[PDB]
Every structure is written in C-alpha cells, then in structure tokens.
Design a binder for this molecule. Sequence first.
Ligand SMILES: Cc1noc(C)c1-c1ccc(CNS(=O)(=O)c2c(C)nn(C)c2Cl)cc1
Length: 250
Amino acid sequence: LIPPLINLLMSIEPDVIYAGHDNTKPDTSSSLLTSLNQLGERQLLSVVKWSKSLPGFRNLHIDDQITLIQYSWMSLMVFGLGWRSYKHVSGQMLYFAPDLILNEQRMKESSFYSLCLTMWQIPQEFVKLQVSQEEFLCMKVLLLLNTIPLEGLRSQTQFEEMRSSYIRELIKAIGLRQKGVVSSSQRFYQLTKLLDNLHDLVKQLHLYCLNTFIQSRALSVEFPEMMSEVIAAQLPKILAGMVKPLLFHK
Ligand SMILES: Cc1noc(C)c1-c1ccc(CNS(=O)(=O)c2c(C)nn(C)c2Cl)cc1
C-alpha cells in the first residue's frame, strides 16, 4: 500500500492550471513569452498554496518559508513542466498547460528554442528512468528544500529534520517498485543525482529569466506582479552564487 505521507502529497497536488492562452492568434515571441509569464504567475500562487499544506513546511520560521520558495520556484516549475510533459505527451512536447503545449514548430526564436531543449532534459530523464508518481512527489519536496542561504536557515534544525523525513519517504517510494537493497540503492543514487544535476540546469533558466526581465520593455514581454517580486527579491543574488545548493553526491 501507499505510505500515508505519499498519499497526502498526492492529495495536495494542485488542480489543472490553465495559461489563459488565446489560441486564436498565432504567437509572436512577445505574446508567447507573455503567456508563459501569465502561467508562471498562476503557478507561483499554486506553489505557495501547496506549501501551506505540505507537512512540516508551515512550522519552519516564516522567513525560511519565503526564502525557500523564492530560491526554488523556478526549479519547482520546470520540474512540474517535466512531469506534465512525461505524463501527458510521453516527454515529446512541453506541456506547460492544457492550453499551452509547445512542439518544436512553435519554438521559432533561437534563444527560446535553446532554453526549451535545456528544459526538455527533465522529461527525457523521467522517460528513461520511468519515474513514478510517488518518487516524483518526494523529489519535488526535496527540490523545495534543496538550496539554503550561505548562513543557513533560522529554523535549521527543523529544516534538517524535514529534509531527512522526505529523504526517507523517497526511499519508501522507491521501495514500492525496486525490490532488493542493491536495486533500491542504485535507484536512490540515480534519483538523487538527477536532483543534484538540476542545480546546473536551473542556472540556465535563471539567467534567461533575468535577461528577459531586464529587457522586458524592449521585448514587449509582460512580467506579472508576484513573479516580478520573487525575481527582484532574490534572482540576482542566486545567480551570483551567494546561496548554498545542497548536494546528495560529491
Ligand atoms: C510556466 C512554466 N513552466 O515551467 C517553467 C520553467 C515555466 C516558467 C518559469 C519561469 C518563467 C519566468 N519568465 S522567463 O524566465 O523569461 C521564461 C518564460 C517566458 N518561459 N520560460 C520557460 C521561462 Cl524560464 C516563465 C515560465
């Protein structure tokens, strides 16, 4: 049977989030990017709502909760993109939302296409490894908790215990399917290495974001208010490497 924390994680997953994308026009660069940012705004709200129901998270110092969301939001979004792409279209298109699904044809602009190829690595890996829902849900919590400030968190003890609890839960999720301690251990290595490797992937998205944000008026790309604040609050600092990514492996 499914362990209870994993069932709970299933229960607190967000409902379907639409981009509000007007698929009557053809997209220019600016309209496509504006629509993705609009979806991003809706997804950021969803992430904060999700965190309020995530066992353990609400008990961290509020400053730590805000910090962790501000550090991890891009990571959580691209990881979720990967999941939806894996689930709905077998990793072969990028399933941003049910009203915003991009195939290669719709990826005209050079830099955005390159960004998409980077993002595509996640669903490709989900397909290759045959990641389960139970594994995904635990890994997703670990991503929220995968980067801390250089000086640590105010609730560092609580945070460490929470992170340990979800590591143990990933081990249970793996154990649902991987039988044998070697197969299970090898799988744990694989899934945690994927998370380690996400730090490098997300750096590329961070840079793209800040570039687009700084150039937003010139590119005619709208950045809604909540996303603008998360970007302004932490992205330059994160990009400068003044944070501590946590790694499972050396
Ligand atoms: C939505 C969504 N799903 O996965 C990802 C990644 C996103 C996402 C994440 C961040 C942002 C912020 N704007 S941006 O960084 O210029 C950008 C745009 C536009 N599209 N994407 C994929 C990015 Cl990153 C917009 C969309």
